[PDB]
C-alpha cells in the first residue's frame, strides 16, 4: 500500500502533462524540488488526493494510473504560493476537495467522454481562495489586488518560465528539468509541451503584452498544457491535428488574458482556468469534425502509443 | 380533498422540502415559525409558493411531483427574498409572483438537465431566478434596494467572540436559511424539522454548527457569525447530505461533515465573487458544494448514494435499505 | 463550391432569426448594408470564415448548407468591429473570431445535443467574450467609448411617441448591433419573406422587450436606443413556433420568456459592469435555454423536435396530421 500510494503519487505528477509515468513524475518533482516547502505542500496535496480516492473506493485502475493525484498536487502548491500554520491543513483540505470535484466532473464530462482536465484543481482552489477577503485565517500575497480593469502603458527566460509557471514555478531551471522529465515518458509530449509555451509566448507578443509577464512565462502555463494535451494524447496526432493544436494553442493565450480581466475586480489569480476552457471547447468539437480524429478518451495514451495502437 | 385543499397540501409540502422534508406538517410548522417575524414576509412567501405550485399544475407536471411539494419549495424563497433584500413597493407583490413562476421553469429546465445523471435540482432554481430578477436593479429602477446591497471591490473590526456569539448564531443560521434573522423562528424551524424526522432536525443543527465553527476557524468578523449568515447554507448541506440523498452511515457522516465544512469556505468565496456587483450570495454556496459532492458519490464505492427518485427521509432511507 | 459557400453564407444570416432561407438572409444583409459597408464586410468576413471552417473540419453538409454554420459567424464579424476601434488587425481578429465560433458551436452542439437543446447564439458570445475580455491587457486593439470599467450604482429622460417608434425598429436592429431605424424595418421585412409568423413574433419580441423595460423603470435613452429589444427579438422569433409547436399556451410561454428576456438583459448588464464589457446576445441565450430545457417536462407545452424544427408554418403543417 505504501509503495502503491508512492507509485500513484509519482504517476499523478506526470499526469500533469498527461504523462502517466512514475519516472516522469519523479523527474518532475526533482525539477520543482525551487522550494522544499512547495515540494512538501505538493506531496501533501498529491498524497491527500490519492489517499482520498482510495477511501471513497475508486476503480484501482484510475488511482494506480495516477489520475487521482494530478490536480491533487496543484492544490498543494498553489494554496501556499498565492504561509501560515494553517497553510498545511488547508492544503490537505484543498487536495481532498479536488477529488470530489474530479468525480463530480468525471461522471459529468464522462457521458460524452470529455476529460476532466485541471478543472478539478481550479474550481476547488477558486472556492478555497475566493473567500479570503472575508475569511482572514490566511493572508494573501502581493500577487493579489482588487482593481477595475484599465489599459496599460525575453525569449529564453520566458520559454522555460512558461513550462514552470504551468506548475506556478517561476524558475528557469525546473522549466528545463520539467521539459526533460517530459522527454523521458515521451519525446512527443516533451516537444508539444515546448511548442506549447512557445506558441503561447509569441501569441502573447503579437497581441501586444507588457514584456514583463511574457518573460515571467505566465502566458506559457496554459499554452504548455494545450500543446501537451491536444498533442497526440487526446487526438490521434496528424497534420490536421497539428494545426488544430496550434489553433487551440494560439487560442490559449487570448483566453488567458480575458480570464485575467474577468477575475481582476475580484483580483484573484486566473490559474489553470484558461487551458481548461479553450481545451474542453476544442475537445467537445472534435467528434463533429470528420477530418479530426479524436483519440478514444478511455483509451487515450501517449502520442506514441496512440500512434502505435492506431497503426493497425 | 379538492383542488384548493391540494394546492394547500402542496404548498404545505413545498415549505418542508426546503429542508428536504416532504411533510405538510413540518411545512406548516415552518411557516408558523417564520410567520413570527413578518406577516408581510409570510404573505410574500405564500404568494411565491402559491405561484410556483399553481404554475406546475398549469404546465402539467406529474402530480406525484406537485403533491410531493417539490414544486413549491424554491417557490417560497423567491416570494421571501424579493421583499427582504429590496425596499417594498407596490410592484413588490407582482414581482414576487413573477419570481416564483420563473423558479418553476428553472426547476424543469434543471430537472431534465440534472436528471440524466440523477442529480437533484437543489435551491438552484430559487437563485438563478432571483439572481436574474435581482441583478438588473441598478438599471431597472422600478424597485429600490435595501442597505444590504452595495457595490464595492474586495478588501481585507474583528469584534469579540462570546457565549452570545454562539447562541444567537446557532439559531440565526437555521433562520438565515430562510433569510430569517430571528432567533425564535430558528428554534421553531428546528422543532418543525423534528416533527417529520429527528434525524433531519439534528443534521440541520450540526449543519449550522459545523458552519458556525468553520467560520470562526477561518477567522471571520464575529458580527456576521452570530448573524448566522454562515449557517444558512451549512444547514441545507447537513440536512441534504444527511441520510436524505445518501444512505446514512459513518463514512457518509464524515462526508457530510466534509461537505458542511466546505460549505462555509464557498459561502465566503461566493461573497467576493458578487461583491463588485455587490449583490447577495443567497443559497448559491450550498447548491454548488452540494452538487459537487453528489456528482462524486457514485464514483465512491465506500459512499452509498441514495437513489434520488427514491430518496426519502433519513429514517425511511434506512428502513427501506434494511433488507 | 463558390455558389454553395454563397448559398450557405446567405442561409446563416437568416438563421440569425432562426430563418433558414437564402432570400431572407440576403434581405437581411441588404438591410444592414445600409448602415456600414465596413460592418457588412466584417460580417461577410465572419460568416465566410465560419462557413469555410465547418467545411474544412468536415461537418455534415446538411448543417452547412442549412446555414447553421454561418449564423454566429456573422455576429463575430460585426461586433469585433463595432464595440472596438477599427485597426488593421481588425479584419484578422474578425476571422479569428468567426472561426472560434465554429469550434464553440461544435463544442456546444455535442454538448446541448444530448438533450436536444439548441446551441443558440451562445457560440457567438463565449467566443467574442473571450476575444473581447482580454483587451485591457492585450493592447493590440483599442476599445470604443461604449466600454467603461465601473462598479454598479443606481437622468430618467422623457417617454414619448418617438421613444416607441425609434425603439421598436432599433430593437430589431440592435439584435444585430445595428443602431439604425431603417434596417430594423428592412430586417423586419426580411423576416416576412421566409415567414410572416417569424416576422410578427420578432416584432412582438422587440415590443414585449420595449414595454417590459419601461415597466421595470429604465432610463428612456437606452429604450429608444432599442438595446432592450435585441434579445427580446430573438426570444420571440425562437420560442415563436420555431422551437415549439405554436399554440395559445405556447404563446403565453413566449410572452413569458419575452418578458423574462429584459430583466435578464439588465441583470447581465450589471454582472459585466465592473468588467464593463458588453452583455451582447448573452441574455436571450440564458433565459432561452432555460425555457427550452423546461419544455419537455411541460405536458401542456409541445416542444418542436429540434432536429426537425422548422418555420412556424412548416412546424404547423407537419404537425397537422
Swiss-Prot record, chain A:
GO terms for molecular function: identical protein binding; urea binding; urea channel activity. The record marks 272 as: Important for channel permeability. Residues 287-312 are cytoplasmic. The keyword Transcription regulation does not apply. InterPro entries: Ammonium/urea_transptr (IPR029020), Urea_transporter (IPR004937). Keywords: Cell membrane, Membrane, Transmembrane, Transmembrane helix, Transport. The chain crosses the membrane at residues 37-56, 61-82, 87-109, 114-134, 188-207, 216-236, 242-263, 266-286. Pfam families: UT. One of its GO terms (biological process) is protein homotrimerization. The keyword Cell membrane applies. Residues 2-17, 22-33, 154-167, 172-183 dip into the membrane without crossing it. Gene3D superfamilies: Ammonium transporter AmtB like domains. Homotrimer; each subunit contains a pore through which urea permeates. Belongs to the urea transporter family. This is Urea transporter DVU1160. It comes from Nitratidesulfovibrio vulgaris (strain ATCC 29579 / DSM 644 / CCUG 34227 / NCIMB 8303 / VKM B-1760 / Hildenborough) (Desulfovibrio vulgaris). The lineage of its organism: Bacteria, Pseudomonadati, Thermodesulfobacteriota, Desulfovibrionia, Desulfovibrionales.
Amino acid at each position: 500500500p505504501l509503495i502503491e500510494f508512492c507509485d500513484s503519487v509519482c504517476r499523478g505528477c506526470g499526469q500533469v502533462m498527461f504523462q502517466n509515468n512514475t519516472v516522469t513524475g519523479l523527474l518532475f518533482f526533482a525539477g520543482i524540488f525551487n522550494s522544499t516547502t512547495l515540494g512538501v505542500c505538493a506531496v501533501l496535496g498529491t498524497a491527500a488526493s490519492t489517499l482520498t480516492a482510495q477511501l471513497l473506493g475508486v476503480d484501482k485502475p484510475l488511482v494506480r494510473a495516477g489520475l487521482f493525484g494530478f490536480n491533487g498536487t496543484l492544490a498543494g502548491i498553489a494554496l501556499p504560493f498565492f504561509y501560515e500554520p494553517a497553510m498545511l491543513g488547508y492544503v490537505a483540505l484543498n487536495g481532498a476537495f479536488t477529488t470530489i470535484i474530479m468525480a463530480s466532473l468525471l461522471n459529468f464530462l464522462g457521458k460524452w467522454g470529455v476529460p476532466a482536465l485541471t478543472a478539478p484543481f481550479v474550481l476547488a482552489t477558486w472556492l478555497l481562495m475566493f473567500g479570503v477577503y472575508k475569511l482572514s485565517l490566511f493572508h494573501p500575497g502581493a500577487l493579489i489586488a482588487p482593481a477595475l480593469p484599465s489599459v496599460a502603458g525575453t525569449f529564453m527566460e520566458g520559454l522555460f518560465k512558461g513550462v514552470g509557471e504551468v506548475m506556478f514555478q517561476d524558475n528557469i531551471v525546473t522549466g528545463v528539468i520539467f521539459v526533460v522529465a517530459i522527454l523521458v515518458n515521451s519525446r512527443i509530449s516533451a516537444l508539444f509541451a515546448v511548442i506549447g509555451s512557445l506558441v503561447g509566448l509569441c501569441t502573447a507578443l503579437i497581441m501586444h503584452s507588457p514584456e514583463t509577464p511574457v518573460r515571467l512565462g505566465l502566458y506559457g502555463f496554459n499554452s504548455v498544457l494545450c500543446g501537451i494535451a491536444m498533442g497526440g494524447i487526446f487526438f490521434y496526432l496528424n497534420i490536421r491535428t497539428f494545426l488544430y493544436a496550434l489553433g487551440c494553442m494560439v487560442l490559449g493565450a487570448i483566453a488567458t488574458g480575458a480570464f485575467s480581466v474577468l477575475l481582476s475586480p475580484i483580483g484573484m489569480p486566473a490559474l489553470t482556468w484558461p487551458f481548461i476552457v479553450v481545451t474542453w471547447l476544442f475537445l467537445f468539437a472534435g467528434s463533429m469534425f470528420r477530418n479530426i480524429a479524436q483519440v478514444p478518451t478511455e483509451k487515450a495514451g501517449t502520442p506514441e502509443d496512440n500512434l502505435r495502437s492506431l497503426a493497425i
